[PDB]
Symmetry: C3
Subunit: 380 residues, 3 copies
């Protein structure tokens, strides 16, 4: 409700007919209408006048007031507009306003009021609607490739893959004299999801076996967006993407308290991830936690209602904690845990097999680097 | 001796068929990764029927 | 058994000695085609091969 009541008044000192959308203003309706509409709603021949902390909108018709009352307001135009539509509907029922004829068509008017303003929100009405109801440097030549990717994952406790998707691009920065043709060879990709974009100056080659892409690179750095998958794409992490982390969550009911063990697994031991954090949520009746972890720091945070474990760099590792809970209610379902991580590989598995350049002698592929970042990575 | 709390860790199982029973005094723990079960054992021999 | 006279499906567990990976490329005006041939174990050698 914003609109307390929609009311037709006689300034005889009583609300002649009126509508209470939901039980609130019963008897209240009559006293307001009876005092205030007598004074012209205390108006001066102004449509808005407010008295005793209630907004009264009105129009005089004879010894009668057609009145809209609100004590809250959403918009200027609106309050008038419901009153106005009401004023098209009221002479159809009662041939202007007049207490005896208003009285006789209590049902008509009242029904219109419910229809016009429903639970205090100003709906619209019309006389036809109403009817249904009442019916040169090449020494320098070098090339660098940077594959930046983000992976997203939703997984069950069971380890169900659910949905995943990798987003990425491979940027190339090349210092090469002349205009050299380059051929790029990459692994073959599949994607449950979809998206691939190719930079201009990218040509597609058809070969009986293997796929190839060739292009003259712009100098400096540019998104390759080569052909093949492209060097600008959304691939599905689902399609052959590796999820650097798998979290195995074992919640346990210690009884009054709860013991949670969180298992983190990384890919090959040799590779190390960085900026890893595991966010393990906790229930509202927290008490306090005791957490233990071999590597990194772990801290419980109230407010957040989550325990956050941070590890600068990890070959791979795990954490455990015991929680104390007051037990209101019954058991609560767990919310998913999320992780942030950085890995020096792409888990879209993009591999740059070979980029051979022509128009000249061998350039040096000084470096190829891979930056892998976590997107929305969630596991229950 | 004493009453010691024990935590059991086992591999994760699946079953086309169905049936699992847990002894009382078996608690279930929820962990982000891995599953764990904890319980104070009755002394002597008993069916664990852990979680 | 299967028989010593049969049509078996190469599909059913037959090995295809060669897999060809064709990568056509649009050089632009021209076309560059790379054809990749793969054989089974390196030790074994095929003969009379033509692509």
């Amino acid at each position: 409700m914003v609109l307390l009541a929609a009311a037709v008044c006689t300034k005889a000192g009583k609300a002649i007919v009126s509508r209470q959308f939901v039980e609130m203003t019963r008897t209240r309706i009559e006293g307001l209408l009876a005092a205030f509409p007598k004074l012209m709603n205390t108006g001066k021949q102004h449509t808005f006048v407010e008295t005793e902390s209630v907004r009264y909108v009105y129009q005089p018709m004879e010894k009668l007031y057609m009145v809209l009352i609100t004590t809250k307001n959403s918009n200027i135009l609106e309050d008038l507009e419901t009153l106005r539509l009401f004023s098209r509907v009221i002479p159809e029922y009662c041939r202007a306003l007049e207490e005896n004829e208003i009285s006789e068509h209590c049902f008509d008017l009242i029904f219109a009021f419910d229809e016009i303003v429903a639970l205090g929100y100003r709906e619209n009405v019309n006389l036809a609607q109403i009817r249904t109801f009442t019916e040169p440097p090449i020494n320098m030549e070098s090339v660098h490739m940077k594959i930046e990717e983000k992976i997203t994952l939703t997984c069950g406790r069971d380890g169900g893959l659910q949905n995943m998707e990798l987003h990425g691009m491979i940027m190339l920065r090349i210092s090469d004299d002349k205009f050299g043709r380059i051929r790029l060879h990459v692994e073959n990709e599949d994607k449950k999801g979809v998206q691939l974009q190719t930079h201009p100056n990218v040509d597609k080659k058809l070969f009986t076996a293997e796929s190839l892409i060739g292009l003259k690179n712009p100098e400096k750095s540019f998104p390759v967006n080569s052909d093949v998958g492209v060097l600008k794409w959304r691939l599905q992490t689902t399609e052959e993407s590796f999820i650097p982390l798998t979290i195995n969550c074992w919640p346990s009911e210690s009884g009054n308290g709860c013991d949670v063990n969180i298992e983190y697994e990384l890919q090959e031991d040799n590779l190390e991830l960085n900026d890893v954090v595991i966010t393990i949520p906790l229930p509202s009746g927290v008490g306090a936690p005791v957490i233990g972890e071999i590597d990194g720091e772990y801290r419980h945070d109230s407010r957040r209602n989550t325990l956050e474990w941070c590890l600068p760099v990890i070959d791979a590792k795990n954490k455990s904690g015991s929680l104390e809970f007051s037990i209101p209610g019954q058991p609560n379902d767990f919310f998913p845990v999320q992780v942030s991580f950085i890995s020096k590989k792409n888990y879209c598995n993009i591999q740059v097999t070979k980029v051979t350049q022509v128009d000249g002698n061998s350039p040096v592929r000084f470096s190829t680097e891979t930056t892998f970042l976590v997107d929305k990575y969630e596991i229950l």
